[PDB]
Each structure stands twice: as structure tokens, then as C-alpha cells.
Amino acid sequence: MDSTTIQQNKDTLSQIVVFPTGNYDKNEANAMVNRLANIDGKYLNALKQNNLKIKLLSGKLTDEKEYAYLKGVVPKGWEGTGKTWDDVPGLGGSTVALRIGFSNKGKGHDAINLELHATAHAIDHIVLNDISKSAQFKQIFAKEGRSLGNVNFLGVYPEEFFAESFAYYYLNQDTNSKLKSACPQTYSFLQNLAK
Amino acid sequence: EVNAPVP
Ligand SMILES: [Zn+2]
């Protein structure tokens, strides 16, 4: 990724990312946008065209009017954790909402990166028309979906294997190399998807 | 559709 392309992607994200009202960590919000700018510009442009907003939050997701209906609800795959959506720091799918400061593994989740995982879900659902549930990806998932850990979540839900693999592919060179070694068919699939 | 991160 050259200088102009990273800048172009940040420009696209300037039309996608929504910052919270009130006090928030501006530096960390900027760092999250910079990580999202590593995503292939084709996907970011499609998110913008679809008026998908990436909402950065300074408080709980369920304190937003549009997610209040999830109070007390246990997310898919979170059975037995003792947590509900009130405790979950990010959400992706038909919308994206993310708590600032909770990017890294261990900040209330075990994803390699919160914002890439959530945005991957939006790309899957909105841009790629649920490609993670296509026969092609289900076949890859059947072979490689238990090779990235967290097998009772990533190994059981193809959309979660897709989202986490996408996050590995786009976070940094180290995670990208790890994905290629663990899940070569998934890596090739993502490489071809971006063409 | 809503999806949480890895638990
Ligand atoms: Zn997820």
C-alpha cells in the first residue's frame, strides 16, 4: 500500500466514520481509523456507496437508541460467557458500532482487532451479499475453520471465521503471514476477492 | 444483522 492509496482510504473513511458526541479519546479514534484504512479501498468505497456508517462510541453499545433492544440479550456464540450485549464492545453486520479503546485482544473480546472484525461483518453482509454463507466459502470453512483457534466460535460459524480471517489479512503484515500459513485456501480466497 | 466479536 503506497502513500496515495492509504490517504485515499482515509479520505473514504472520512465519509464512513462517525465520531461520538461529547468527550472521547481523539487519538485512539484516529488510530482505529488508520487501522481501518488498511482495508482494500474497493471495500471501503462500497461501504461508502451503501451509506454504511462506522459509529465510534464512548460508552456502551446498548446505550445507543438503535441497540437498546439488545439489552440483556446474549450474542450468538457468547453462550455461557455470562455476558450480554450490554458488555460487548463492538458490533458488525447491517451496521457497525465500536467502543473506542477496545481494539485489542483482551478488551472484552478475543478478536485480533475489534474494528476490523466488525467491519468485516459489514463487508460480508452489505458489500459481498453474505459470501461467508456461500457454498464456496462453506467448503473452505469446513477444511480450515478450526485452524485459527477459538474453535467453538470461529469453527462453528462461517461468518465468524470469515470476519476473523479478514481481520488477520488486513491488520498488519504479521497477522497476514500467520493467516497464510494456517489457512492457505482462506488466504487465497481473500486475495482473489480483492481483485 | 448483528454480530459480536470473538468471545
Ligand atoms: Zn463476529
**DSSP state letters, A41-52:** HHHHHHHHHTT-
What's the rounded Cα separation, in Å, for the pair A134 and A139?
9
Residue numbers in A near B6 (CB within 8 A):
109-111, 117, 150, 153-154, 160, 164
CA distance readout (Å), A102 to A35, A56, A175: 13, 11, 18
Residue numbers in A near B2 (CB within 8 A):
67, 70, 75, 85, 91-95
* The three grid cell numbers given for residue A10, joined into one nine-digit string: 482515509
CA distance readout (Å), A133 to A78, A89, A185: 20, 25, 16
Q: What are the E-state strand segments in A100-173?
A: none
3-class secondary structure, A75: coil
What's the rounded Cα separation, in Å, for the pair B5 and A164?
9
3-class secondary structure, A17: strand
> Among A180, A174, A156, A164, which Cα is nearest to A111's?
A164
What Rg do the C-alpha atoms of chain A give, in angstroms? 16
Instruction: Let me know: does A109 contact B7? Beta carbons within 8 Å.
Output: yes
Cell 479501498, residue located:
A41
Structure determination technique employed:
X-ray
Residue numbers in B near A158 (CB within 8 A):
none
What's the rounded Cα separation, in Å, for the pair A73 and A180?
35
What's the rounded Cα separation, in Å, for the pair A74 and A82?
8
What Rg do the C-alpha atoms of chain B give, in angstroms? 6
- Choose among B1, B3, B6: nearest Cβ to A110: B6
- Choose among A94, A111, A125: nearest Cβ to B5: A111
Phi, psi of B6 (to 5 degrees): -55, 130
- State chain B's maximal CA–CA distance in angstroms: 18
Cell 445507543, residue located:
A64
How many C-beta atoms lie closer than 10 Å to residue A96's C-beta?
27
What's the rounded Cα separation, in Å, for the pair A44 and A50?
10
CA angle centred on A164, ends A17 and A43, rounded to 5°:
45
Q: How far is the CA of A3 from the centre of ligand 1 (A)?
A: 30
How many C-beta atoms lie closer than 10 Å to residue A176's C-beta?
15
Cell 479503546, residue located:
A101
What's the rounded Cα separation, in Å, for the pair A1 and A10?
12
